[PDB]
Design a protein around this ligand. Structure first.
Ligand SMILES: *Cc1c(COP(=O)(O)O)cnc(C)c1O
Ligand SMILES: *Cc1c(COP(=O)(O)O)cnc(C)c1O
Ligand SMILES: *Cc1c(COP(=O)(O)O)cnc(C)c1O
Ligand SMILES: *Cc1c(COP(=O)(O)O)cnc(C)c1O
Lengths: 393, 393, 393, 393
């Protein structure tokens, strides 16, 4: 096979194909540390040392770039190490801006590599209105997590990309978009003036919950050589095994996301018709979504994704309740898995954060977050129903 | 089993034991991303998210700590990520000192995390004499690679710890020892006034070269909690698979290192009587070793390790010769491999470092560096011989 | 989760659930050979010896049985060893009947286990008409490969089941149906008076062609107990890894096959309207299929499967041509791969069998066989076209 | 590397080397089902189909054969599958002979492929005295389990090979010897007139208790080609992963087996000087062993192995007691593991066999059988002591 501007599905199946003399339709698992060489100076095949590069990683990387309509890609130990290679690629003592509704990741990473006080950070909700007033103070990074977790607030990647060129032209301010929740299938941030697309491969891409891997894609060659250097040097790289496993699960990503999203929409609509036991509902798929205009311009076919957020006509109990009365959806952490899961950001995730903010940024104390899996739609829909009542009673 | 201050070998086999309701003698490979929870608040068992912690990694770490006579252990994606995690725990804008004869590692990591010019670095040969004059200039770390590659100079970990307490008491200067080549079986730096022990697990712990992973061990609960935070936050973590494989590999570590040492020594004694074709020989196990006194106070039973370094009765050729004529020792990089290898630091390794230094630090141009594996001693002894002449001829 | 007569998709996700005290959502890979015991008599948990039974294999077996709407399942090293265990459970020196359009598998296995001349074998095309005439001569087995490779002739599993109770009631003649190409999703032979369903898990269940493993399922307890005995005594079992990897791969079986089918169906009808370059088309999904009456009664939603067989308006070349000119369809062997493949049964497969037969059973010398993967539909449809011409010219 | 009649440890580390253009010092895991082809006729590399052959198996096979001082090797799903292929390779309606003290393996297998009543089987204890009288009755196979499990009775492979040439010249009676318990290291049955060496690689070869794989070796090219035939046709093949994991355990076979043996010997002497609490003790390494003369001619350095067997100065309780009072040894089935194990053949193993026999073959009801691992020797010795008293009190 040899792609030539085929469709997404065709690309998932063959992008990042491999090189085998034997003729293996399937890629082998190369865990080899080192490789023999023709002359001391240079190898008996493009590979010299695993960490520097190995076939499984390299190939998973070529695949994620393509799927992400990007020229380049790099896999790391996790999503956290990926965000972190980015932050440490920043000139010493810099500043970065990011949406509020973010994983504690930024909090963490942003700060750590900001050893003692290194990389400044000014969290900001509503990106398009405070970015100009904030765009400087040493800024060099703009971090957007398109659909926020759990509120699900979509952001206009283009309006941001522009607003930057405007309020900070000449100072190399790169824009990074976290595209984990939608996944390469639903959207491609680079196609909207984004310098780097970052994913937590643990979720959708691998999609089977058995690999903690992260990846980034960029069309900017220099920004990609720097970032790869840090990779080769700080060594927060992925295991040939995890890459290969992830590479394998991404081949059904288009299939798994399509299904996962239809179902989500069919579940949101249901919860958005029950004026009774359902207070608010969050799902970028609903035409009533606050930024549905962006959905239609960044989301393929306007798929809402697999995440749905909603608050019931009750309180913390009903929610903590729903989280258990459930039979098919499994209470836990994480998401984007092959199996349905549901979590209450407030308690589970957003812990060390006073209810003070868990009302402001959106994280309502009585909010139930859910990750739609690929189980039968009706078996799941009917299940959400069967659980509302329980909570109510 | 339940260890109770048993012997190294017993600990290698039962430290880091696992829990399994099915009563498995062998620890299963857990790749799950998440774990179910009884109540939104907390899990149906001690684990919540694989990156935060998972059975395979955690057991590996208890095992490594055990063998290192240490209370705590942490595993990461690689040696380089382990050194990294340590330098980024240092307060912003800090300095460190380290023996000259080091892997490019320090240079790299030390600088990278010293974003632009962050973590200072003053390399120094002969630690015990220039350390007091250097102990400041912003120093917070002293890095020691006990057996220097490839000169094989041994450093007294105690004298350095003491010297530190003297010329810089009151400044939390932590001492880290890279104990990779010797491995936990041959030495335990914590027992000599070292605050952290580092291992690139690929060489001898895993011992089969089929895994890139690194770990550290400490007795200091605070330093361990900080380091663990960065572990969870930057996410430069190992794959439950590479961790489980490495743990599997660790179980024959006492056997594998013991052998590799008896043979290295019996080989060193051979090259140490051939006054003809042998210029010099470097093996910490020879009673004629410069710091043999330190070998005696820090090396179990005085084993020298499996790394011999020697200079033949000729030059660049005779070495580049040997490096090939050999039948049993395989020309490449790396080491600590189960299989016998051989490398010429100068070329293969220390590249972009002008001959100027490659005669300074000790990295002689006509020096042959070998890594004794586990084949038959005599088969190996005899091969080294049949190899001298080739070179000669 | 705990299924309760849910839909296929839900079963595929939750059938064969595992048990683990750490509450992992994903089943761990258990490779362990043995299990600890409380007392000499019996284990500290349901398992005693891996080959006798281990969690990964057991859970897959339940999973497969469920998706196959059956009470029992058994996994072996391969399709072939699955067929053997069966043939070798037949009373010494017996006879069996099977549709001609069969893999060489029957040939081999049936023969081998028929040591020297043990298990008789009377291949017979057109089952329903000569089965009464051959039902005896020592028969004890009738082997149906529902969609014949490659002709794609569908057989009525009921009509045969009945015929048998007729021309041989009172002689335990077991009906075995190979349900590999269609897979549990498209059909369930048990629901049609079949004693055993077989699958070569390599193609569609594991799906990603990275595992050789076979399984069967039956509702018959005795037959299952004998078979399971041979399994434990000959030991032709798969490895816990191969089992887990297959299990992982089945979780998207419904998404994968449903797709491959709609695509296969859309590429048939195209090929089935080009009266010009297309002679005949073979796709159980066309309402013009010889046994489309049987397709409607046995195939779910009337899916045709992902196997299309057709003959262009030319000869050998044009076919061998097509098998190359194609860009998206990868020329090779096997099939039911995640990726589109095409083969010419005659050459590639049906070798050591004279053109004599290769015009009889239907294996036409100018017949193009293709397996539909999960690449984009139009990319593939458009590609078949792009291929027809090349061959033409 | 290129072996040239080097020593066992050298062959262990290099026999079975692989082919990689890249130059991997470490053999990669090839799971690929298939391989591409130069021309429809023959591939683009000596491999065409995984089953017919794949690198990981083949390389394993080469290594085992080499360690077994043999020309040929063949791996299978299990020891059982390996015994199975051998029995089904026999001419329809044959007879075999094997030592009484055997694993239910002959029993099951010998009988199964002996469909209904196919391959005869006359179990005999004391081989050299009843072999002439039984040698016929249709016999074609003579199965010898050198050290019997668990009495630990040694048999003279030469006396029996000879005895066969005398009482049955001309009838191709092949002699197979189960070399599992001693392993390639301690003995090489072919060098003693044996036509086939069988091993359960689950035990000492892989030796980490995470793989069920069996392998045989023979110098007889015709017997090897028939047997490989059945292999390819029945499909009871090992997986690429299990072969790879095993090959990786075999690299320390000589170090592990060397240690397990010294320990078991030092433990047997202890139990053979405790006139008080130890009735009898079975260990082929004690000069007082009934067949010590054979030991000294078949066993390397006269190593007794890792399996001891003994009866305590009490009865059934004292034993069941011992089997639990132990801290370091682990009560379970199996053996040859890296970690110590202990079992009571009577109950655990030999269940469905009336006490009647369990006093005949020697499987005394008050007999404790132990599998010495590689933990420290004194820790284990001191642990056996500490447990005799427990059983006593
Ligand atoms: C889960 C998640 C992460 C964490 O990824 P790791 O690979 O687990 O570090 C980061 N970002 C988002 C948006 C996530 O949902
Ligand atoms: C090989 C080596 C390392 C490198 O470890 P990685 O896991 O590959 O980063 C570190 N230290 C020493 C002393 C080594 O020899
Ligand atoms: C490929 C195939 C087989 C072979 O299966 P193995 O797992 O290689 O033994 C058997 N049956 C069908 C119908 C196949 O398509
Ligand atoms: C354990 C054992 C077997 C069984 O091997 P499998 O690989 O489980 O079939 C056969 N023979 C002996 C002598 C054993 O010790």
């Amino acid at each position: 096979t040899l792609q030539e501007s085929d469709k997404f599905a065709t690309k998932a199946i063959h992008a990042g194909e491999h090189v085998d003399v034997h003729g293996s339709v399937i890629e082998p698992i190369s865990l080899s540390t080192t490789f023999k060489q023709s002359s001391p100076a240079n190898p008996i095949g493009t590979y010299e040392y695993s960490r520097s590069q190995n076939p499984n990683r390299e190939n998973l990387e070529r695949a994620v770039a393509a799927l992400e309509n990007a020229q380049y890609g790099l896999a790391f130990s996790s999503g956290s190490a990926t965000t972190a290679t980015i932050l440490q690629s920043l000139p010493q003592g810099s500043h970065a801006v990011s949406i509020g509704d973010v994983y504690g990741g930024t909090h963490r990473y942003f700060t750590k590599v900001a050893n003692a006080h290194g990389v400044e950070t000014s969290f900001t909700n509503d990106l398009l209105n405070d970015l100009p007033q904030l765009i400087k103070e040493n800024t060099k990074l703009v971090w957007i997590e398109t659909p926020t977790n759990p509120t699900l607030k979509v952001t206009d990647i283009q309006k941001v990309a522009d607003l930057i060129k405007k309020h900070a032209a000449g100072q190399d301010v790169i824009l990074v978009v976290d595209n984990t929740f939608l996944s390469p299938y639903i959207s491609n941030p680079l196609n909207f003036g984004a310098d780097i697309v970052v994913h937590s491969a643990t979720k959708y891409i691998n999609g089977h919950s058995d690999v903690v891997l992260g990846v980034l894609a960029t069309n900017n060659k220099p920004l990609y050589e720097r970032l790869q250097f840090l990779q080769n040097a700080i060594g927060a790289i992925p295991s040939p095994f995890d890459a290969w496993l992830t590479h394998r699960g991404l081949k059904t990503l288009h299939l798994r996301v399509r299904q996962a999203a239809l179902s989500a929409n069919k579940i949101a609509e249901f919860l958005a018709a029950d004026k009774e036991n359902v207070v608010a509902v969050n799902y970028p798929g609903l035409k009533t979504h606050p930024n549905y205009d962006v959905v239609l311009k960044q989301h393929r076919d306007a798929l809402g994704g697999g995440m749905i957020s909603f608050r019931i006509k009750g309180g913390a109990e009903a929610a903590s309740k729903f989280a258990s009365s459930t039979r098919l959806f499994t209470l836990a952490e994480s998401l984007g898995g092959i199996e349905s899961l549901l979590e209450v950001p407030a308690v589970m995730t957003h812990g060390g954060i006073p209810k003070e903010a868990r009302e402001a940024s959106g994280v309502f104390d009585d909010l139930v977050r859910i990750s739609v899996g690929i189980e039968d739609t009706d078996d799941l829909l009917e299940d959400i129903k069967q659980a509302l009542k329980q909570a109510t009673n």
